[PDB]
């Protein structure tokens, strides 16, 4: 009579690497590396992302006339730019501290847009109806940004304007404006009358003064002039005051901001869908409890840690020796 | 390889034994059979389950991480940000892969150790009431019915009881 | 029967450790690697006490906000402490240019010699030196001003051009601070400085600026629609700094000759300062430990154990304990 | 355990043996007692001391490290600074916790091995002059006085000396 | 060591066995000599070669890395850059040193294990046809010429063939 | 007295030692070093291309064309750029080189260029003075001089009319354009040089746009000059145009650089001698020739190098504990 000691074998074809030898077949193992996603852009906390489409952040917040679909946007789980996100500033110029504004937006989960300076009643002594350009066309006609107002001389006079807004919204307000720089002194005169024009913007914390920089530049979208774009975050209770004798592209609409965490701006050409996820990448969503993933380093939500690995399989059972 | 049992002095595994990782094959008059060892297997299961949960537990999930943008006069801080992202990624990739390699070696050696310990356990129960073959098998010097076998498996084998019979046959 | 048994030690230890295969293993001996104790006090390093800013911050200290008078004598410290109430900084509203860089500079200063760079009573014979006070900087019931700067105004109905240089003969870097005032109106400009169109210029071997007042009413802060910007520079040994102005200069009065040292820093803490000594300081308290790790605070001054998020790091030295 | 001695074929430890980690308990006609094994315990103490010191020595101390301040237009670099601090903190917490976990496993197994090897050393000294009980104990076939016992403890047991007596009784 | 053989029950090494890591010394009427065990030696070489290569493979090379410069008003970012460079250097120095320490231990133990398993392999082939001395040696209870020795070395020793001769001499 | 077989292991005369967790300095029969600590003490070619030796010049002195840096006027391609501890010729006229560190960062991915006369001196400026813009601060060979790659324009007669001058980039690659803005110490010197008290300089391309206005302040002499000049640069993309407009104070581009981008280059500081050898890996101390994973020679490297660590030894055991006794 006999008794033997022995160990399990099965038909497992799972392999793992060890330090002394590669590709060892084991009876059981577990994969620690997620390499699968659903190829879509989903909701988080059941909230849909904001798809900018052919627009970028600048085109959205300024209201580039190509971005009118976004006018209604007010809340999102994250923001999506695409490979075709080219509509931003349609009048050439510099968007001052643009990358910083993008970083700010990354912690904004919603806003309420409102008419900070109503076009019809804010500017009785200035022309509000002629500030359009072929650089920002819409429907084959010269136009302009929807959230800013290009003020010009009424008749032959641009009197000193002074306009203030007090922030009674109970939260931060994002105010955007521009300053225009004609290419010639006669153009400065046509638009604004005053050769020695200035723009001054002040709040409790912001304080800047701008003067026209008149010079011929290479034409960009037909324009030898430039417009620089500016922004500030006005704190609850604070006031912002504009004073100008020309060259002000005035705020028309502004944005009362709601801060939230875990949001962000991603770049992706993946389709938006009605599904819901805990973890989103620019390639697609992940539904996994595995500790690692090799899908993408950019993530929104709660995700496995990105690593460059192709295989992370941990042995749990033993060397498989079925002979 | 470390403990000499798996792929060693016990040359091969048993596809016939499906209810556990380690166990016994017995053969007597009353029949032959496979029987997993509940205790050794279960201790191996709790151990490995703990190993896996511990590996996973050390790995913080990743919360929102997205890109930053930089203008054409911020190339130094753009390159710094890139040095930071690439450097952390090199380190985590290294840590993940190395932890899996080393732990896999340890896990296979652990199973080897469990088999070996089970073997020597049985060998200490039986002593001279059986002879060792060299391949994980013992030949008894007495009749060991399924009651006796069972005793050998659950560690209650009574040596003195059969010591005389075995001495005789031996 | 005659016998010998081989065995191992057991004791009454209740020390537990974690291993990969099993948690809370009781072992006969072990060593804790994790420091979790501190004394709850801010202590001296190398026998030198920290500088407690108290209700002031770094700006209030260096400018001499009138609420910061207890710091007027401070000259050396081991590290600098701000508190949750370090609120007194710039009392007249405006921007402190490169303020964070100045804080970083002061982080590697271990002492200084404060000196009267331009004595108030003798430096400014053609200008008014006694009227430069403001309700924005009130102290003890009266309008006042920074102790380390001097607000020059017109003498009678005249503010003639001033020109004033200082040569650095201190044998080390000198920190010089000044301001430029921007009134809210032409009326206040003329009232303070007489000259409607004024400037301030500052030059050294490395610094070069002409400042022009920017006259505009901003929202009132601390009762002021005007603004004052604050500037600073480090003058190298042997270099000269030259100030010229026809108005709007908040002149240096006191400057600081800097001694550089390493291992210093600024921390924020509400823990009390005490006459104790340490080699390692955190914002929660001092640490006296030769252990490799601590979970007390990531901010440390001195020679400290490495900060980790762990609650337990216990290394087995002895064996499994089985009594 | 990996080597099968501690909490293994030697069920438990000795609160009676206070002067070392490993050793012997004997009973002869002269009396009983515990005695630590100097050689084994000491080698283990040197090894463990070295392991602890190596771990500590690889962790170079933290020198002055304080927060940085950033203005309201420096959010990108403020966030970069935070990413760097958190990232290094993740890595060091991971490395500390993991090093202690893995080394703790190794230390326990080192001890287990030291006990196994001590038992095997005695076993090959004694050969068939004693019978193995199986619980870590040997019963001699001859009289083994305090001097004989001491020779077993210090590795200089004279097998031939007692082979004839032992055969007789065996 | 962990497995008790090297510097253990086999007290020292053999400078006379030059063509392998583990092996055999024999003595019989025909003569004396050393011979490496090819199977165990080659298995160890393969393992260790794989270990070294796996270590190197996880160390992707360093491409161009040159210093960044900062002006006198960029002290915070200069210091951030230094914190990053120092932090990564601390980590990589730590990983390289520790990996070498731990793996060196594992490697010596792997050798100790291979010697122990080779010894136990021979022991179980020979059984009671030889007596264990204790120092890694076996004395045959039967004559064992060169062909017989080679059978022990290549793992084909025939215990039953020599059992009767052995039993006569053992008693 | 029977036949015998013993089991045993290799020993040899190796003296190699390794450290382990439990024990230091263990002698082993075989081992491999993973730490490269040897270099050849020289600066070598990479891909068979020599480095550019700035010598007594720095990158500012090279690009602006400090007259002391004339030996560099012919440099056109390099594998990396070498500054030394005596690289002090740069901005001979005192002032600030704006975004200089950014320019240095850009140059780290430039492997060659073609210098060209962007605005030829003799024909570009018919209404301004082109011959009087020299200074003792930039003296060469016993005479007042100036940067070779810029041109200090001043008033002709009693007038400085508005200039406007454009360059279209037809080079098929990025063009690095440098210019300067002079800041006199007094309003009087402003008038004497440029006539217009209210002067400006404007520079614009499709993407770049900046206005510069003299900042006139009394200030000390540096290299004999109370004036300052700020130096500026921009990268003009293929097909784009740059336009300079000024009513004074412009230090005009004269020569500019069409750049070729290439990876894995950079700027190092080293006093080691350049030699005619080739390497895969260069550090400031010397070149490395090694297949090892780690090195402790230098954290700065160019090419494909082992990883820098602070370790003084990294030796892996491969063989066993060596016990010849
Ligand atoms: C929303 O975003 C879109 C996409 O970016 C913009 O559409 C582009 O507008 C630009 C600017 O006008 C167009 O670029 C211009 O193209 C002219 C001809 O382009 C050729 O190729 C296109 C596409 O293949 C053809 O449709 C076209 O018939 C031509 O064959 C050029 O003449 C222009 O060059 C001149 O001006 C530029 C300065 O801007 C100079 O640098 C040049 O040297 C030259 O003098 C110019 O490059 C582009 O074609 C449009 N793309 C598409 C896909 O439509 C929208 O305008 C934008 N809308 C808003 C309001 O933001
Ligand atoms: C030293 O620091 C202390 C503590 O920070 C500081 O005392 C604080 O001063 C301010 C004075 O502005 C006080 O806050 C004010 O409270 C009044 C009364 O309720 C408000 O009306 C004020 O708001 C008006 O003005 C604001 C602009 O400044 C407007 O935004 C607002 O709409 C109103 O018009 C203002 O909030 C605060 O109460 C005290 N606190 C204490 C503890 O005394 C002190 O002034 C500092 N001293 C110096 C010289 O730095
Ligand atoms: C090229 O670089 C060299 C080396 O730096 C420059 O030469 C150095 O020029 C400085 C400034 O003129 C000299 O320092 C000065 O010396 C005089 C006394 O002789 C003193 O009065 C000044 O205050 C200052 O200390 C320095 O001596 C001189 N060194 C050498 C080695 O000659 C040179 O000017 C540079 N040339 C150009 C065109 O960039
Ligand atoms: C192994 O067994 C399963 C069922 O237990 C069977 O479905 C499968 O085909 C087999 N797999 C392999 C790899 O042989
Ligand atoms: C994700 O997978 C789990 C289990 O695989 C499942 O229960 C859950 O419904 C899935 N969730 C989504 C959003 O796909
Ligand atoms: C544990 O044992 C030691 C040694 O006998 C003794 O000093 C100590 O007081 C004991 N502690 C406890 C908690 O029993
Ligand atoms: C092993 O040794 C025997 C006896 O010397 C020999 O005849 C046989 O061919 C060998 N087998 C192998 C593995 O080559
Ligand atoms: C060690 O051996 C090598 C050849 O194997 C020989 O060249 C060298 O001289 C020897 N060294 C000693 C210690 O004699």
């Amino acid at each position: 009579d006999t008794i033997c000691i022995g160990y399990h074998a099965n038909n497992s074809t799972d392999t793992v690497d060890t330090v002394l030898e590669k590709n060892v077949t084991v009876t059981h193992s577990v994969n620690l590396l997620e390499d699968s996603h659903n190829g879509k852009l989903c909701k988080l906390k059941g909230i849909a992302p904001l798809q900018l489409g052919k627009c970028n952040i600048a085109g959205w917040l300024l209201g580039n006339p190509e971005c009118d679909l976004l006018l209604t946007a007010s809340s999102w789980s994250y923001i999506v730019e695409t490979s075709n996100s080219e509509n931003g500033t349609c009048y050439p110029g510099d968007f001052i501290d643009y990358e910083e504004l993008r970083e700010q937006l990354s912690s904004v989960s919603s806003f309420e847009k409102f008419e900070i300076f109503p076009k019809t009643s804010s500017w009785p002594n200035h022309e509000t109806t002629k500030g359009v350009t072929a650089a920002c066309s819409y429907a084959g006609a010269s136009s302009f940004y929807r959230n800013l107002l290009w003020l010009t001389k009424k008749g032959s006079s641009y009197p000193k304007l002074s306009k203030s807004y007090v922030n009674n919204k109970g939260k931060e307000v994002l105010v955007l404006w521009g300053v225009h720089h004609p290419p010639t002194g006669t153009e400065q005169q046509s638009l604004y009358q005053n050769a020695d024009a200035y723009v001054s913007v002040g709040s409790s914390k912001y304080n800047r003064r701008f003067t026209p920089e008149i010079a011929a530049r290479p034409k960009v979208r037909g324009q030898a002039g430039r417009m620089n774009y500016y922004w500030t975050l006005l704190e609850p209770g604070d006031t912002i005051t504009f004073e100008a004798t020309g060259n002000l592209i005035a705020p028309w609409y502004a944005f009362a901001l709601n801060r939230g965490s875990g949001s962000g701006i991603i770049t992706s050409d993946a389709p938006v869908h009605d599904c819901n996820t805990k973890c989103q990448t620019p390639h697609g969503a992940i539904n996994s409890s595995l500790p690692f993933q090799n899908i993408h380093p950019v993530t929104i939500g709660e995700c496995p840690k990105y690593v460059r690995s192709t295989k992370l399989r941990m042995a749990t059972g033993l060397r498989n020796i079925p002979s | 390889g470390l403990f000499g049992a798996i792929a060693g002095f016990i040359e091969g595994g048993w596809t016939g034994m499906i209810d556990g990782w380690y166990g016994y094959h017995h053969q007597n008059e009353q029949g032959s059979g496979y029987a997993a060892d509940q205790k050794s297997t279960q201790n191996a299961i709790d151990g490995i389950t703990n190993k896996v949960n511990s590996v996973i537990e050390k790995m913080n999930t990743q919360f929102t991480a997205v890109g930053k943008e930089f203008n054409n006069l911020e190339r130094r801080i753009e390159n710094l940000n890139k040095k930071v992202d690439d450097g952390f990624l090199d380190i985590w990739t290294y840590n993940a892969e190395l932890l899996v390699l080393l732990e896999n070696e340890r896990t296979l050696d652990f199973h080897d150790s469990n088999v070996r310990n089970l073997y020597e356990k049985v060998k200490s129960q039986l002593k001279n009431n059986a002879k060792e073959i060299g391949n994980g098998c013992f030949e008894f010097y007495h009749k060991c019915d399924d009651a006796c076998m069972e005793s050998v498996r659950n560690g209650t084998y009574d040596y003195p009881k059969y010591s005389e019979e075995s001495k005789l046959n031996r």
Side-chain angles (χ1 to χ4, degrees), chain A, chain B:
Chain A
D1 302 327
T2 69
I3 190 72
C4 305
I5 300 311
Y7 49 88
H8 169 68
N10 58 24
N11 53 353
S12 177
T13 54
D14 289 330
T15 58
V16 300
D17 285 342
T18 76
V19 58
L20 294 186
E21 70 197 88
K22 296 185 180 188
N23 263 308
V24 187
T25 295
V26 293
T27 58
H28 305 86
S29 72
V30 302
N31 173 229
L32 302 182
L33 175 70
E34 188 56 73
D35 51 25
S36 288
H37 56 87
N38 78 170
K40 312 191 294 176
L41 299 183
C42 302
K43 312 182 202 301
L44 277 55
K45 273 47 187 166
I47 295 177
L50 174 60
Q51 168 65 267
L52 299 184
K54 66 180 60 181
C55 301
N56 57 45
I57 291 287
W60 171 38
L61 296 179
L62 303 172
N64 177 314
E66 282 287 302
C67 313
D68 285 349
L69 304 183
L70 298 181
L71 288 172
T72 61
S74 58
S75 68
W76 56 85
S77 51
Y78 52 102
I79 295 158
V80 179
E81 283 175 347
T82 70
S83 301
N84 300 140
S85 291
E86 284 161 37
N87 296 109
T89 55
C90 47
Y91 199 101
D94 286 345
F95 194 132
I96 287 55
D97 295 319
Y98 179 53
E99 292 80 14
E100 286 287 315
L101 177 55
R102 295 169 64 95
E103 193 81 353
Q104 289 286 343
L105 278 165
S106 302
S107 64
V108 172
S109 47
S110 74
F111 60 39
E112 299 94 35
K113 186 199 200 173
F114 69 99
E115 218 178 357
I116 178 171
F117 295 136
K119 164 182 193 185
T120 55
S121 57
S122 298
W123 313 112
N125 302 306
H126 296 79
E127 180 61 66
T128 66
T129 70
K130 288 184 186 175
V132 292
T133 170
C136 300
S137 306
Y138 171 68
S142 299
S143 196
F144 200 60
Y145 300 110
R146 319 320 206 169
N147 301 333
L148 301 181
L149 187 60
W150 187 350
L151 295 172
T152 58
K153 70 177 188 196
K154 204 164 75 144
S156 72
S157 148
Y158 189 116
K160 186 186 90 176
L161 68 82
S162 175
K163 202 70 182 180
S164 298
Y165 167 76
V166 182
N167 178 3
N168 59 326
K169 301 294 188 174
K171 67 200 67 178
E172 301 160 273
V173 171
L174 172 65
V175 187
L176 301 123
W177 70 96
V179 179
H180 186 236
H181 301 277
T184 65
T186 53
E187 181 170 314
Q188 169 68 201
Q189 201 170 306
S190 290
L191 293 172
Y192 312 119
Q193 193 59 56
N194 307 316
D196 58 351
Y198 71 90
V199 173
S200 176
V201 182
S203 71
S204 79
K205 294 188 304 174
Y206 196 87
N207 176 28
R208 228 166 137 172
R209 191 180 180 272
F210 309 96
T211 54
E213 289 169 5
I214 296 162
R217 286 102 190 172
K219 296 182 193 188
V220 174
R221 300 177 63 77
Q223 308 307 311
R226 298 293 186 262
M227 202 168 282
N228 294 336
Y229 313 88
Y230 296 99
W231 59 279
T232 195
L233 291 167
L234 191 60
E235 288 157 320
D238 201 8
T239 296
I240 187 158
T241 294
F242 291 81
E243 176 178 316
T245 49
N247 299 261
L248 178 58
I249 313 303
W252 182 3
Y253 295 83
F255 304 92
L257 302 186
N258 297 307
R259 296 286 182 176
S261 69
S263 177
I265 298 170
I266 64 169
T267 302
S268 170
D269 293 336
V272 168
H273 272 83
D274 191 272
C275 67
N276 195 43
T277 191
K278 307 197 307 86
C279 177
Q280 185 70 62
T281 84
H283 284 339
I286 300 168
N287 179 30
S288 177
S289 41
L290 301 184
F292 299 107
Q293 53 98 3
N294 60 5
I295 295 156
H296 209 290
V298 167
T299 55
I300 312 286
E302 295 178 0
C303 294
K305 187 64 164 173
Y306 183 73
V307 287
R308 298 195 184 92
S309 309
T310 54
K311 182 188 187 86
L312 291 169
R313 182 172 287 275
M314 194 161 172
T316 51
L318 61 151
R319 188 175 305 261
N320 189 20
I321 303 167
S323 281
Chain B
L2 239 46
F3 294 94
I6 289 174
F9 80 85
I10 301 175
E11 281 183 319
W14 285 340
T15 53
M17 185 185 63
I18 65 178
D19 51 346
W21 271 336
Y22 326 115
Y24 313 86
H25 178 65
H26 83 278
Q27 175 181 343
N28 56 194
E29 179 252 18
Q30 225 169 188
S32 303
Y34 288 103
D37 186 70
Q38 313 296 351
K39 187 169 183 176
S40 285
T41 290
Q42 190 55 46
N43 285 335
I45 284 173
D46 299 346
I48 296 292
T49 291
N50 203 96
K51 177 187 285 215
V52 172
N53 294 341
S54 299
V55 165
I56 297 178
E57 182 173 17
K58 295 287 167 270
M59 299 313 314
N60 320 330
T61 68
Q62 177 178 325
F63 294 102
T64 297
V66 305
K68 299 188 192 313
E69 310 222 324
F70 302 92
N71 73 36
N72 66 13
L73 293 180
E74 296 174 318
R75 187 78 78 74
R76 293 167 300 144
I77 65 175
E78 179 180 275
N79 286 344
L80 174 57
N81 181 67
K82 184 66 175 160
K83 169 166 61 178
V84 171
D85 293 342
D86 280 335
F88 282 150
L89 174 57
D90 289 338
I91 291 165
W92 278 114
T93 294
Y94 174 93
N95 282 350
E97 293 183 348
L98 185 73
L99 178 64
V100 170
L101 269 187
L102 276 33
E103 269 319 297
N104 283 344
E105 194 76 49
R106 298 276 290 167
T107 292
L108 303 181
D109 291 330
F110 171 62
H111 289 301
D112 199 0
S113 178
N114 293 332
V115 169
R116 187 185 176 94
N117 284 341
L118 183 58
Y119 179 84
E120 306 241 59
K121 181 176 174 179
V122 173
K123 169 183 181 173
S124 62
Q125 289 197 61
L126 306 182
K127 302 161 188 172
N128 53 249
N129 282 188
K131 66 173 181 180
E132 295 185 80
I133 303 310
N135 54 6
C137 287
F138 299 85
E139 183 182 348
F140 288 95
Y141 287 115
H142 60 101
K143 247 206 62 170
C144 198
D145 87 312
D146 295 15
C148 179
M149 291 303 186
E150 183 59 30
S151 85
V152 171
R153 306 205 205 98
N154 68 30
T156 61
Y157 173 90
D158 191 308
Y159 167 91
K161 181 173 181 176
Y162 310 101
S163 50
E164 301 143 22
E165 176 186 341
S166 292
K167 168 189 176 295
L168 280 163
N169 297 324
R170 189 168 71 257

